[PDB]
């Protein structure tokens, strides 16, 4: 409102909160992967979404989504998580990178293989 007021208690910015805080605010992280489960999403949709509870490197343990039809993951493994949430499964704020570390890319995927990690099959 008033200048005098702004002069006194000055206007204060409101910091932002990284939707993904699996620390360092850094590209991706390595994690041991505690369990490999499958769950059900919100009311509108109904699948058997695949997920894994991963013990990151920085100590935070967190649940991550496994994108693509099928995966090699299980018990131990060592995926590397990324970012981007999964608006359908709450709590799932991270996606494990496919075809990274102990994670196998989606078998046979031919479209947009950059994700789901796969290599050009016989050009």
């Amino acid at each position: 409102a008033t200048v005098n007021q702004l002069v006194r208690k000055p206007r204060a910015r409101k910091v932002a909160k990284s939707n993904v805080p699996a620390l360092e605010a850094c590209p991706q992280k390595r994690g041991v992967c505690t369990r490999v489960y499958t769950t059900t999403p919100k009311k509108p949709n109904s699948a058997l979404r695949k997920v894994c509870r991963v013990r990151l490197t920085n100590g935070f343990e967190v649940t991550s989504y496994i994108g693509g039809e099928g995966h090699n993951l299980q018990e131990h493994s060592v995926i590397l998580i990324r970012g981007g949430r999964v608006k359908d499964l709450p709590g799932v704020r991270y996606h494990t990178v496919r075809g990274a570390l102990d994670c196998s890319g989606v078998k046979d995927r031919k479209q947009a293989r950059s994700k789901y990690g796969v290599k050009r099959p016989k050009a």
Binding site: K42, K43, P44, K87, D88, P90
Partner: peptide, 6 residues
């Protein structure tokens, strides 16, 4: 119209 909570 509205989802996951509304």
């Amino acid at each position: 119209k509205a989802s996951s909570x509304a």
